[PDB]
Amino acid sequence: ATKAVCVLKGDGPVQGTIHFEAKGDTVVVTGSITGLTEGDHGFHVHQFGDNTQGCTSAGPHFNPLSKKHGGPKDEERHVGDLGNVTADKNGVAIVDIVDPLISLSGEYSIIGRTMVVHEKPDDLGRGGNEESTKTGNAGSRLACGVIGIAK
Amino acid sequence: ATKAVCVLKGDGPVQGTIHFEAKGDTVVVTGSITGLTEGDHGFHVHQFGDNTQGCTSAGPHFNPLSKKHGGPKDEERHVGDLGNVTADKNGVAIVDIVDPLISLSGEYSIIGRTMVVHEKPDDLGRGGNEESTKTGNAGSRLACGVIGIAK
Ligand SMILES: [Cu+2]
Ligand SMILES: [Cu+2]
Ligand SMILES: [Zn+2]
Ligand SMILES: [Zn+2]
């Protein structure tokens, strides 16, 4: 696939539409998320595209290379670690990310996996505690969706 | 990869969970759908995993070999043509299918595409009008979900 899309939904008011486009050896991630509290919110690809138990069944961050959690510019990061999105005072986050590790084809393909936006900021593995190294202390999963193939 | 799952939802009461498992060289489809009217209901893989406009944005039947619509046992069918599921008087349809054209990897992969359950029976391409050769006259899309990777 060259293009993909994800619609984020949850039990609360958070919702959004994320688009993905392969460009060169990168994936361009664009879209918007609404209903968030102003400030930063962790934003990652989780391993499974299983929404049988809401966002909980999506599993942990996508990590085929068995690394610790980090920020997007770090060498030591999960393939799914896309850092944070930032909501404004009206609860709207505009997504504009370029990433070279996620892919829409091959081994690191995220098609069929789940995008999740979280309750708190991702501390990018620099939190000083053990949870920082696993999840970034991003807390709750507010909304998620399975990444599908788009036209 | 080897296992996939889809949660079907829509604007009505129809809901369901469908599991896919690669066994040997084929794909086994199992699960259940509830909230349906008694009788047969078309059940197909549609091309796009795009639920931005509900089930409408899933597009037509997945059809990489550019054939006309048919039943699952026909030579002339779309890869997405899985026939009908049958609901009992209580509105429950048990799904138990084995198909030789869909896959979970490669060119025929359905990961990231959309499973749809329709309002009316699929006539398996034998209705005699142009619409039969496209959709089986299965009608509206009652529920759908994007097919994701499962553990
Ligand atoms: Cu996450
Ligand atoms: Cu259909
Ligand atoms: Zn991570
Ligand atoms: Zn068809």
Side-chain angles (χ1 to χ4, degrees), chain A residues 1-2 4-8 10-88 90-151, chain B residues 1-88 90-133 135-151:
Chain A
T2 300
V5 67
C6 184
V7 173
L8 308 172
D11 309 292
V14 178
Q15 61 201 338
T17 296
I18 305 302
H19 295 273
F20 303 83
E21 193 183 348
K23 181 156 86 199
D25 64 350
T26 68
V27 175
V28 178
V29 186
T30 58
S32 68
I33 304 161
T34 57
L36 294 163
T37 55
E38 66 189 300
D40 279 4
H41 293 87
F43 182 62
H44 320 116
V45 184
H46 286 238
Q47 197 177 168
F48 303 109
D50 180 335
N51 184 48
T52 58
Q53 292 194 52
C55 303
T56 302
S57 45
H61 303 174
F62 184 42
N63 185 26
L65 297 163
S66 307
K67 294 189 162 200
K68 292 190 296 206
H69 181 76
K73 288 155 281 146
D74 296 330
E75 208 181 309
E76 183 80 1
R77 60 169 262 201
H78 292 147
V79 170
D81 290 341
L82 297 181
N84 291 291
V85 296
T86 305
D88 67 12
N90 292 297
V92 175
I94 298 311
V95 181
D96 190 74
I97 296 174
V98 176
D99 191 78
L101 250 299
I102 56 171
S103 190
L104 296 182
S105 57
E107 295 280 69
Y108 303 148
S109 178
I110 57 169
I111 297 296
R113 299 184 195 277
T114 293
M115 292 296 316
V116 178
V117 60
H118 290 267
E119 175 181 57
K120 323 221 202 106
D122 183 331
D123 73 16
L124 313 179
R126 290 165 169 81
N129 62 20
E130 185 183 7
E131 189 57 40
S132 172
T133 238
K134 319 271 196 48
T135 64
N137 285 291
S140 253
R141 300 174 183 197
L142 299 180
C144 52
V146 184
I147 297 167
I149 297 167
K151 184 174 213 192
Chain B
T2 167
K3 286 164 89 190
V5 67
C6 188
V7 178
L8 304 172
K9 285 178 203 154
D11 294 329
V14 178
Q15 266 171 327
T17 299
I18 307 300
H19 295 282
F20 304 82
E21 179 171 25
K23 297 316 293 167
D25 296 312
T26 196
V27 179
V28 173
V29 184
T30 57
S32 53
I33 304 157
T34 60
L36 294 163
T37 55
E38 172 195 299
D40 285 354
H41 289 87
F43 187 58
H44 314 130
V45 184
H46 287 234
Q47 191 172 176
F48 306 115
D50 181 334
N51 291 0
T52 55
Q53 300 177 329
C55 304
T56 295
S57 43
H61 292 173
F62 179 42
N63 184 24
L65 290 168
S66 300
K67 299 198 184 184
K68 294 182 179 191
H69 183 81
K73 295 170 179 165
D74 296 326
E75 300 180 0
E76 190 74 7
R77 57 175 266 203
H78 295 146
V79 166
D81 289 347
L82 303 175
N84 287 296
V85 290
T86 306
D88 61 18
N90 289 334
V92 180
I94 299 292
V95 181
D96 196 324
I97 293 174
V98 178
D99 192 73
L101 294 299
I102 61 174
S103 193
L104 298 187
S105 67
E107 180 172 36
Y108 299 95
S109 182
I110 60 179
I111 301 297
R113 301 189 187 275
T114 293
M115 203 64 225
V116 176
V117 62
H118 287 272
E119 191 170 31
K120 286 185 195 278
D122 182 339
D123 69 19
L124 302 323
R126 299 202 234 325
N129 55 8
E130 188 185 17
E131 189 65 38
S132 184
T133 77
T135 65
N137 287 288
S140 75
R141 304 175 185 200
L142 301 174
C144 52
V146 179
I147 300 157
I149 291 173
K151 191 176 131 79

Coordinates of all heavy atoms in Angstrom, one line a residue, chain B residues 14-106, unseen atoms left out:
Chain B
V14 N -26.9 -4.3 14.4 CA -26.1 -5.4 14.0 C -24.6 -5.3 14.5 O -24.0 -4.2 14.3 CB -26.1 -5.6 12.4 CG1 -25.1 -6.7 12.0 CG2 -27.5 -5.8 11.9
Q15 N -24.1 -6.3 15.1 CA -22.8 -6.3 15.6 C -22.2 -7.7 15.5 O -22.9 -8.7 15.3 CB -22.8 -6.1 17.1 CG -22.6 -4.6 17.6 CD -22.9 -4.5 19.1 OE1 -23.7 -5.2 19.6 NE2 -22.1 -3.5 19.6
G16 N -20.8 -7.8 15.5 CA -20.3 -9.1 15.4 C -18.8 -9.1 15.4 O -18.2 -8.0 15.3
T17 N -18.2 -10.2 15.7 CA -16.7 -10.4 15.7 C -16.4 -11.5 14.8 O -16.9 -12.6 15.0 CB -16.2 -10.6 17.1 OG1 -16.6 -9.6 18.0 CG2 -14.7 -10.8 17.1
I18 N -15.5 -11.3 13.9 CA -15.1 -12.3 12.9 C -13.6 -12.6 13.1 O -12.8 -11.6 13.2 CB -15.3 -11.8 11.5 CG1 -16.7 -11.3 11.3 CG2 -15.0 -12.9 10.5 CD1 -17.8 -12.4 11.5
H19 N -13.2 -13.8 13.2 CA -11.8 -14.2 13.3 C -11.3 -14.9 12.0 O -12.1 -15.6 11.3 CB -11.6 -15.2 14.4 CG -12.0 -14.7 15.8 ND1 -11.1 -13.9 16.5 CD2 -13.1 -14.8 16.6 CE1 -11.7 -13.5 17.6 NE2 -12.9 -14.1 17.7
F20 N -10.0 -14.7 11.7 CA -9.5 -15.3 10.5 C -8.2 -16.0 10.9 O -7.4 -15.5 11.7 CB -9.1 -14.2 9.5 CG -10.2 -13.3 9.1 CD1 -10.5 -12.2 9.9 CD2 -10.9 -13.5 7.9 CE1 -11.6 -11.4 9.5 CE2 -11.9 -12.7 7.5 CZ -12.3 -11.6 8.4
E21 N -8.0 -17.2 10.5 CA -6.8 -17.9 10.8 C -6.2 -18.7 9.6 O -6.9 -19.3 8.9 CB -7.1 -18.9 12.0 CG -5.8 -19.6 12.4 CD -5.9 -20.5 13.6 OE1 -7.0 -21.0 14.0 OE2 -4.8 -20.7 14.1
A22 N -4.9 -18.5 9.4 CA -4.3 -19.2 8.3 C -4.0 -20.6 8.7 O -3.2 -20.8 9.7 CB -3.0 -18.5 7.8
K23 N -4.6 -21.6 8.1 CA -4.4 -23.0 8.5 C -3.9 -23.7 7.3 O -4.6 -23.8 6.3 CB -5.6 -23.8 9.0 CG -6.3 -23.3 10.3 CD -5.4 -23.0 11.4 CE -4.7 -24.1 12.0 NZ -3.6 -23.6 13.0
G24 N -2.6 -24.1 7.3 CA -2.1 -24.8 6.1 C -2.0 -23.8 5.0 O -1.4 -22.7 5.2
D25 N -2.6 -24.1 3.9 CA -2.5 -23.2 2.7 C -3.8 -22.4 2.6 O -4.0 -21.8 1.5 CB -2.3 -23.9 1.4 CG -0.9 -24.6 1.4 OD1 0.1 -24.0 1.7 OD2 -0.9 -25.8 0.9
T26 N -4.7 -22.5 3.5 CA -6.0 -21.8 3.4 C -6.4 -20.9 4.5 O -5.5 -20.7 5.5 CB -7.2 -22.8 3.1 OG1 -8.3 -22.1 2.6 CG2 -7.6 -23.5 4.4
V27 N -7.5 -20.2 4.4 CA -7.9 -19.3 5.5 C -9.2 -19.7 6.0 O -10.2 -20.0 5.3 CB -8.0 -17.8 5.0 CG1 -8.5 -16.9 6.1 CG2 -6.7 -17.3 4.4
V28 N -9.3 -19.9 7.3 CA -10.6 -20.3 8.0 C -11.2 -19.0 8.7 O -10.5 -18.3 9.4 CB -10.2 -21.3 9.1 CG1 -11.4 -21.6 10.0 CG2 -9.7 -22.6 8.5
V29 N -12.4 -18.8 8.4 CA -13.2 -17.7 8.9 C -14.2 -18.1 9.9 O -15.1 -18.9 9.5 CB -13.9 -16.9 7.7 CG1 -14.5 -15.6 8.2 CG2 -12.8 -16.6 6.7
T30 N -14.2 -17.6 11.1 CA -15.2 -18.0 12.1 C -15.8 -16.8 12.9 O -15.2 -15.7 12.8 CB -14.6 -19.0 13.2 OG1 -13.5 -18.4 13.8 CG2 -14.2 -20.3 12.6
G31 N -16.8 -17.0 13.6 CA -17.4 -16.0 14.5 C -18.9 -15.9 14.5 O -19.5 -16.9 14.1
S32 N -19.4 -14.8 14.9 CA -20.9 -14.7 15.0 C -21.3 -13.2 14.8 O -20.5 -12.3 15.1 CB -21.4 -15.2 16.3 OG -20.8 -14.6 17.4
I33 N -22.5 -13.1 14.2 CA -23.1 -11.7 13.9 C -24.5 -11.7 14.6 O -25.2 -12.7 14.4 CB -23.2 -11.5 12.4 CG1 -21.8 -11.6 11.7 CG2 -23.7 -10.1 12.2 CD1 -21.9 -11.8 10.3
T34 N -24.8 -10.7 15.3 CA -26.1 -10.6 16.0 C -26.9 -9.4 15.5 O -26.4 -8.5 14.8 CB -26.0 -10.6 17.5 OG1 -25.2 -9.5 17.9 CG2 -25.3 -11.9 18.0
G35 N -28.2 -9.3 15.8 CA -29.0 -8.2 15.5 C -29.5 -8.3 14.0 O -30.1 -7.3 13.5
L36 N -29.4 -9.4 13.3 CA -29.8 -9.5 11.9 C -31.2 -9.9 11.8 O -31.8 -10.6 12.7 CB -28.9 -10.5 11.2 CG -27.4 -10.1 11.0 CD1 -26.7 -11.4 10.6 CD2 -27.3 -9.0 9.9
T37 N -31.8 -9.6 10.6 CA -33.2 -10.2 10.4 C -33.0 -11.6 10.0 O -31.9 -12.0 9.4 CB -33.9 -9.4 9.3 OG1 -33.1 -9.4 8.1 CG2 -34.2 -8.0 9.7
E38 N -34.0 -12.5 10.2 CA -33.9 -13.9 9.8 C -33.6 -14.0 8.4 O -34.2 -13.3 7.5 CB -35.1 -14.6 10.3 CG -35.3 -16.1 9.8 CD -36.7 -16.5 10.0 OE1 -37.2 -16.5 11.2 OE2 -37.4 -16.8 9.1
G39 N -32.8 -15.0 8.0 CA -32.5 -15.2 6.6 C -31.1 -15.0 6.2 O -30.2 -14.8 7.0
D40 N -30.9 -15.0 4.8 CA -29.6 -14.8 4.3 C -29.1 -13.3 4.1 O -29.9 -12.4 3.8 CB -29.4 -15.5 2.9 CG -29.3 -17.0 3.1 OD1 -29.2 -17.6 4.1 OD2 -29.3 -17.6 2.0
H41 N -27.8 -13.1 4.4 CA -27.3 -11.7 4.3 C -25.9 -11.8 3.6 O -25.1 -12.6 3.9 CB -27.0 -11.1 5.7 CG -28.3 -10.8 6.4 ND1 -29.0 -11.7 7.1 CD2 -29.1 -9.6 6.4 CE1 -30.1 -11.1 7.6 NE2 -30.2 -9.9 7.1
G42 N -25.7 -11.0 2.5 CA -24.5 -11.0 1.8 C -23.3 -10.7 2.8 O -23.4 -9.8 3.6
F43 N -22.2 -11.3 2.5 CA -21.0 -11.2 3.4 C -19.7 -11.1 2.6 O -19.4 -12.0 1.9 CB -21.0 -12.4 4.3 CG -20.0 -12.4 5.4 CD1 -20.0 -11.4 6.4 CD2 -19.1 -13.4 5.5 CE1 -19.1 -11.4 7.5 CE2 -18.2 -13.4 6.6 CZ -18.2 -12.5 7.5
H44 N -19.1 -9.9 2.5 CA -18.0 -9.7 1.6 C -16.9 -8.9 2.1 O -17.0 -8.0 3.0 CB -18.6 -8.8 0.4 CG -19.9 -9.1 -0.2 ND1 -20.9 -8.3 -0.4 CD2 -20.3 -10.3 -0.6 CE1 -21.9 -8.9 -0.9 NE2 -21.6 -10.2 -1.1
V45 N -15.7 -9.1 1.5 CA -14.5 -8.3 1.8 C -14.6 -7.1 0.8 O -14.5 -7.4 -0.4 CB -13.2 -9.0 1.6 CG1 -12.0 -8.1 2.1 CG2 -13.2 -10.3 2.5
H46 N -14.7 -5.9 1.3 CA -14.6 -4.7 0.4 C -13.2 -4.2 0.4 O -12.4 -4.5 1.2 CB -15.7 -3.7 0.8 CG -17.1 -4.1 0.5 ND1 -17.9 -3.3 -0.3 CD2 -17.8 -5.2 0.8 CE1 -19.1 -3.9 -0.4 NE2 -19.0 -5.0 0.3
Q47 N -12.9 -3.5 -0.7 CA -11.5 -3.1 -1.0 C -10.8 -2.2 0.0 O -9.6 -2.6 0.3 CB -11.5 -2.4 -2.3 CG -10.1 -2.1 -2.9 CD -10.1 -1.6 -4.3 OE1 -9.1 -1.3 -4.9 NE2 -11.3 -1.4 -4.9
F48 N -11.4 -1.2 0.5 CA -10.6 -0.2 1.3 C -11.0 -0.4 2.8 O -12.1 -0.6 3.2 CB -10.9 1.2 0.9 CG -10.6 1.4 -0.6 CD1 -11.6 1.7 -1.4 CD2 -9.3 1.2 -1.0 CE1 -11.3 1.8 -2.8 CE2 -9.0 1.4 -2.4 CZ -10.0 1.7 -3.2
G49 N -10.0 -0.2 3.7 CA -10.2 -0.2 5.1 C -10.4 1.3 5.6 O -9.7 1.8 6.5
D50 N -11.3 2.0 4.9 CA -11.6 3.4 5.2 C -13.0 3.5 5.7 O -14.0 3.2 5.0 CB -11.5 4.1 3.8 CG -11.7 5.6 3.9 OD1 -12.4 6.1 4.8 OD2 -11.2 6.2 3.0
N51 N -13.1 3.9 7.0 CA -14.4 4.0 7.6 C -14.7 5.5 7.9 O -15.5 5.8 8.8 CB -14.6 3.0 8.7 CG -14.6 1.5 8.2 OD1 -14.6 1.0 7.1 ND2 -14.7 0.6 9.2
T52 N -14.1 6.4 7.0 CA -14.3 7.9 7.3 C -15.8 8.2 7.0 O -16.2 9.3 7.5 CB -13.4 8.7 6.4 OG1 -13.5 8.4 5.0 CG2 -11.9 8.6 6.9
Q53 N -16.4 7.5 6.1 CA -17.8 7.8 5.8 C -18.6 6.5 6.1 O -19.3 5.9 5.3 CB -18.1 8.2 4.3 CG -17.4 9.4 3.8 CD -17.7 9.7 2.4 OE1 -17.9 8.7 1.6 NE2 -17.7 10.9 2.0
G54 N -18.4 6.0 7.3 CA -19.0 4.7 7.7 C -18.6 3.6 6.8 O -17.5 3.5 6.3
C55 N -19.6 2.7 6.5 CA -19.2 1.6 5.6 C -19.2 2.0 4.1 O -18.7 1.2 3.3 CB -20.2 0.5 5.8 SG -20.4 -0.1 7.5
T56 N -19.7 3.1 3.7 CA -19.7 3.6 2.3 C -18.3 3.8 1.7 O -18.1 3.4 0.6 CB -20.5 4.9 2.3 OG1 -21.8 4.6 2.7 CG2 -20.6 5.4 0.8
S57 N -17.4 4.3 2.6 CA -16.0 4.5 2.1 C -15.2 3.2 2.0 O -14.1 3.4 1.5 CB -15.3 5.6 3.0 OG -15.6 5.3 4.3
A58 N -15.8 2.1 2.3 CA -15.0 0.8 2.0 C -14.9 0.5 0.5 O -14.1 -0.4 0.1 CB -15.7 -0.3 2.8
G59 N -15.7 1.2 -0.3 CA -15.5 0.9 -1.8 C -16.2 -0.4 -2.2 O -17.1 -0.9 -1.5
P60 N -15.9 -0.9 -3.4 CA -16.5 -2.1 -3.9 C -15.8 -3.3 -3.4 O -15.0 -3.3 -2.5 CB -16.2 -1.9 -5.4 CG -14.9 -1.3 -5.5 CD -14.9 -0.3 -4.3
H61 N -16.3 -4.5 -3.9 CA -15.7 -5.7 -3.5 C -14.2 -5.8 -3.9 O -13.8 -5.3 -4.9 CB -16.4 -6.9 -4.2 CG -17.8 -7.0 -3.6 ND1 -18.8 -7.9 -4.1 CD2 -18.4 -6.3 -2.6 CE1 -19.9 -7.7 -3.4 NE2 -19.6 -6.7 -2.5
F62 N -13.4 -6.4 -3.0 CA -12.0 -6.6 -3.3 C -11.9 -7.5 -4.5 O -12.4 -8.6 -4.5 CB -11.3 -7.2 -2.0 CG -9.8 -7.5 -2.2 CD1 -9.0 -6.6 -2.8 CD2 -9.4 -8.6 -1.6 CE1 -7.6 -6.9 -2.9 CE2 -8.0 -8.9 -1.7 CZ -7.2 -8.1 -2.4
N63 N -11.2 -7.0 -5.5 CA -11.3 -7.7 -6.8 C -10.0 -7.5 -7.6 O -10.0 -6.9 -8.7 CB -12.5 -7.1 -7.6 CG -12.8 -7.7 -8.9 OD1 -12.4 -8.9 -9.1 ND2 -13.5 -7.0 -9.8
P64 N -8.9 -8.0 -7.2 CA -7.6 -7.9 -7.8 C -7.5 -8.5 -9.2 O -6.7 -8.1 -10.0 CB -6.6 -8.4 -6.8 CG -7.4 -9.4 -6.0 CD -8.7 -8.8 -5.9
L65 N -8.3 -9.5 -9.4 CA -8.3 -10.2 -10.7 C -9.3 -9.7 -11.7 O -9.4 -10.2 -12.8 CB -8.5 -11.7 -10.5 CG -7.3 -12.4 -9.7 CD1 -7.7 -13.8 -9.2 CD2 -6.1 -12.5 -10.7
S66 N -10.0 -8.6 -11.3 CA -11.0 -7.9 -12.2 C -12.0 -8.8 -12.8 O -12.2 -8.8 -14.1 CB -10.2 -7.2 -13.4 OG -9.3 -6.3 -12.8
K67 N -12.7 -9.6 -12.0 CA -13.7 -10.5 -12.5 C -15.1 -9.9 -12.1 O -15.1 -8.9 -11.4 CB -13.6 -11.9 -11.8 CG -12.3 -12.5 -12.2 CD -12.3 -14.0 -11.9 CE -10.9 -14.6 -12.2 NZ -11.0 -16.1 -12.0
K68 N -16.2 -10.6 -12.5 CA -17.5 -10.2 -12.1 C -17.9 -10.9 -10.8 O -17.2 -11.8 -10.4 CB -18.5 -10.7 -13.2 CG -18.3 -10.0 -14.5 CD -19.3 -10.4 -15.6 CE -19.0 -9.7 -16.9 NZ -20.0 -9.8 -17.9
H69 N -18.9 -10.4 -10.2 CA -19.3 -10.9 -8.9 C -19.9 -12.4 -9.1 O -20.6 -12.6 -10.0 CB -20.5 -10.0 -8.4 CG -21.0 -10.4 -7.1 ND1 -20.3 -10.1 -5.9 CD2 -22.1 -11.1 -6.7 CE1 -21.0 -10.6 -4.9 NE2 -22.1 -11.3 -5.4
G70 N -19.6 -13.2 -8.0 CA -20.1 -14.5 -8.1 C -20.3 -15.1 -6.6 O -20.2 -14.3 -5.7
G71 N -20.5 -16.4 -6.6 CA -20.6 -17.1 -5.2 C -19.2 -17.6 -4.9 O -18.3 -17.7 -5.7
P72 N -19.0 -18.0 -3.6 CA -17.6 -18.4 -3.2 C -17.2 -19.7 -4.0 O -16.0 -19.9 -4.2 CB -17.8 -18.7 -1.7 CG -19.3 -18.7 -1.5 CD -19.9 -17.9 -2.5
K73 N -18.1 -20.5 -4.5 CA -17.7 -21.7 -5.2 C -17.5 -21.6 -6.6 O -17.1 -22.5 -7.4 CB -18.7 -22.9 -4.9 CG -18.7 -23.2 -3.4 CD -19.9 -24.2 -3.1 CE -19.8 -24.6 -1.6 NZ -21.1 -25.1 -1.2
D74 N -17.8 -20.4 -7.2 CA -17.6 -20.1 -8.6 C -16.2 -19.7 -9.0 O -15.4 -19.1 -8.2 CB -18.5 -18.9 -9.0 CG -19.9 -19.2 -8.8 OD1 -20.3 -20.4 -9.0 OD2 -20.7 -18.3 -8.5
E75 N -15.9 -20.1 -10.3 CA -14.6 -19.7 -10.9 C -14.6 -18.2 -11.2 O -13.6 -17.4 -10.9 CB -14.4 -20.4 -12.3 CG -14.3 -21.9 -12.1 CD -14.1 -22.6 -13.4 OE1 -14.0 -21.9 -14.5 OE2 -14.0 -23.9 -13.4
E76 N -15.7 -17.6 -11.6 CA -15.9 -16.2 -11.8 C -16.5 -15.6 -10.6 O -17.7 -15.7 -10.3 CB -16.8 -15.9 -13.0 CG -16.8 -14.5 -13.4 CD -15.7 -13.9 -14.2 OE1 -14.7 -14.6 -14.6 OE2 -15.7 -12.7 -14.4
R77 N -15.6 -15.0 -9.8 CA -16.0 -14.3 -8.5 C -15.0 -13.3 -8.2 O -13.9 -13.3 -8.7 CB -16.2 -15.2 -7.3 CG -14.9 -16.0 -7.0 CD -15.1 -16.8 -5.7 NE -14.6 -16.0 -4.6 CZ -14.2 -16.5 -3.5 NH1 -14.2 -17.8 -3.2 NH2 -13.7 -15.7 -2.5
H78 N -15.4 -12.3 -7.3 CA -14.4 -11.4 -6.8 C -13.7 -12.1 -5.7 O -14.3 -13.0 -5.0 CB -15.2 -10.2 -6.1 CG -16.0 -9.4 -7.1 ND1 -17.3 -8.9 -6.7 CD2 -15.7 -9.1 -8.3 CE1 -17.6 -8.2 -7.8 NE2 -16.7 -8.3 -8.8
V79 N -12.4 -11.8 -5.3 CA -11.8 -12.4 -4.2 C -12.5 -12.1 -2.9 O -12.7 -13.0 -2.1 CB -10.3 -11.8 -4.1 CG1 -9.8 -12.2 -2.7 CG2 -9.5 -12.3 -5.3
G80 N -13.2 -11.0 -2.8 CA -14.0 -10.7 -1.6 C -15.3 -11.4 -1.5 O -16.0 -11.1 -0.5
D81 N -15.7 -12.2 -2.5 CA -17.1 -12.8 -2.5 C -17.2 -14.0 -1.6 O -17.0 -15.1 -2.0 CB -17.5 -13.2 -3.9 CG -17.7 -12.0 -4.7 OD1 -17.9 -10.8 -4.2 OD2 -17.8 -12.1 -6.0
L82 N -17.7 -13.8 -0.3 CA -17.8 -14.9 0.6 C -19.2 -15.4 0.7 O -19.5 -16.1 1.7 CB -17.2 -14.6 2.0 CG -15.7 -14.2 1.9 CD1 -15.2 -13.8 3.3 CD2 -14.8 -15.3 1.4
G83 N -20.1 -15.0 -0.2 CA -21.4 -15.6 -0.2 C -22.4 -15.0 0.8 O -22.4 -13.8 1.0
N84 N -23.2 -15.9 1.5 CA -24.1 -15.4 2.5 C -23.9 -16.0 3.8 O -23.4 -17.2 3.9 CB -25.6 -15.9 2.0 CG -26.1 -15.1 0.9 OD1 -26.3 -13.9 1.0 ND2 -26.3 -15.8 -0.3
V85 N -24.3 -15.3 4.9 CA -24.3 -15.8 6.2 C -25.8 -16.0 6.5 O -26.6 -15.2 5.9 CB -23.6 -15.0 7.3 CG1 -22.1 -15.1 7.1 CG2 -24.0 -13.6 7.3
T86 N -26.2 -16.9 7.3 CA -27.7 -17.1 7.5 C -28.0 -16.9 9.0 O -27.5 -17.5 9.9 CB -28.1 -18.5 7.1 OG1 -27.7 -18.8 5.8 CG2 -29.6 -18.7 7.2
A87 N -28.9 -15.9 9.3 CA -29.3 -15.6 10.6 C -30.6 -16.5 11.0 O -31.4 -16.6 10.2 CB -29.6 -14.2 10.8
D88 N -30.5 -16.9 12.3 CA -31.7 -17.7 12.8 C -32.8 -16.7 13.1 O -32.7 -15.5 13.0 CB -31.4 -18.6 13.9 CG -30.9 -17.9 15.2 OD1 -31.0 -16.7 15.4 OD2 -30.2 -18.6 16.0
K89 N -33.9 -17.3 13.7 CA -35.0 -16.5 14.2 C -34.7 -15.5 15.3 O -35.4 -14.5 15.4 CB -36.2 -17.4 14.6
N90 N -33.6 -15.7 16.0 CA -33.1 -14.9 17.0 C -32.2 -13.8 16.5 O -31.7 -13.0 17.4 CB -32.4 -15.7 18.1 CG -33.5 -16.6 18.9 OD1 -34.6 -16.2 19.0 ND2 -33.0 -17.7 19.4
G91 N -31.9 -13.7 15.2 CA -31.1 -12.8 14.6 C -29.6 -13.1 14.7 O -28.8 -12.3 14.4
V92 N -29.3 -14.4 15.0 CA -27.9 -14.8 15.1 C -27.4 -15.6 13.9 O -28.0 -16.6 13.5 CB -27.6 -15.5 16.4 CG1 -26.2 -16.0 16.5 CG2 -28.0 -14.7 17.6
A93 N -26.2 -15.2 13.4 CA -25.6 -15.9 12.3 C -24.3 -16.4 12.8 O -23.5 -15.6 13.3 CB -25.4 -15.0 11.1
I94 N -24.0 -17.7 12.7 CA -22.7 -18.3 13.0 C -21.9 -18.3 11.7 O -22.4 -18.8 10.7 CB -22.9 -19.7 13.6 CG1 -23.7 -19.6 14.9 CG2 -21.6 -20.3 13.9 CD1 -23.1 -18.9 16.1
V95 N -20.7 -17.9 11.7 CA -19.9 -17.9 10.5 C -18.9 -19.0 10.6 O -18.2 -19.2 11.6 CB -19.1 -16.5 10.4 CG1 -18.3 -16.4 9.1 CG2 -20.1 -15.3 10.4
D96 N -18.9 -19.8 9.5 CA -17.9 -21.0 9.5 C -17.6 -21.2 8.0 O -18.3 -21.8 7.3 CB -18.5 -22.2 10.2 CG -17.5 -23.2 10.5 OD1 -16.5 -23.4 9.7 OD2 -17.7 -23.9 11.6
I97 N -16.5 -20.6 7.6 CA -16.1 -20.6 6.2 C -14.7 -20.9 6.0 O -13.8 -20.6 6.8 CB -16.3 -19.1 5.6 CG1 -17.8 -18.7 5.6 CG2 -15.7 -18.9 4.2 CD1 -18.1 -17.3 5.2
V98 N -14.4 -21.6 4.9 CA -13.0 -21.8 4.5 C -12.9 -21.3 3.1 O -13.8 -21.6 2.3 CB -12.6 -23.3 4.5 CG1 -11.1 -23.5 4.1 CG2 -12.8 -23.9 5.9
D99 N -12.0 -20.5 2.7 CA -11.9 -19.9 1.4 C -10.6 -20.0 0.7 O -9.6 -19.7 1.4 CB -12.3 -18.4 1.5 CG -12.6 -17.8 0.1 OD1 -13.7 -18.1 -0.5 OD2 -11.7 -17.1 -0.4
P100 N -10.5 -20.3 -0.6 CA -9.3 -20.5 -1.2 C -8.7 -19.3 -1.9 O -7.6 -19.3 -2.4 CB -9.6 -21.6 -2.2 CG -11.0 -21.3 -2.7 CD -11.7 -20.8 -1.4
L101 N -9.4 -18.1 -1.9 CA -8.9 -17.0 -2.6 C -8.4 -15.9 -1.7 O -7.4 -15.3 -2.1 CB -9.9 -16.3 -3.6 CG -10.4 -17.1 -4.7 CD1 -9.3 -17.5 -5.7 CD2 -11.1 -18.4 -4.4
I102 N -9.0 -15.7 -0.5 CA -8.5 -14.7 0.4 C -7.2 -15.2 1.0 O -6.9 -16.4 1.1 CB -9.5 -14.3 1.5 CG1 -9.8 -15.5 2.3 CG2 -10.7 -13.7 0.8 CD1 -10.7 -15.3 3.5
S103 N -6.4 -14.2 1.6 CA -5.2 -14.6 2.3 C -4.9 -13.6 3.4 O -5.6 -12.5 3.4 CB -3.9 -14.5 1.3 OG -2.8 -15.2 2.0
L104 N -3.9 -13.9 4.2 CA -3.5 -12.9 5.2 C -2.2 -12.3 4.9 O -1.6 -11.5 5.8 CB -3.5 -13.6 6.6 CG -4.9 -14.0 7.1 CD1 -4.8 -14.5 8.6 CD2 -5.9 -12.9 7.0
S105 N -1.6 -12.6 3.7 CA -0.3 -12.0 3.4 C -0.2 -12.0 1.8 O -0.8 -12.9 1.2 CB 0.9 -12.7 4.0 OG 0.9 -14.0 3.5
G106 N 0.6 -11.1 1.3 CA 0.8 -11.1 -0.2 C -0.3 -10.3 -0.9 O -1.1 -9.6 -0.3

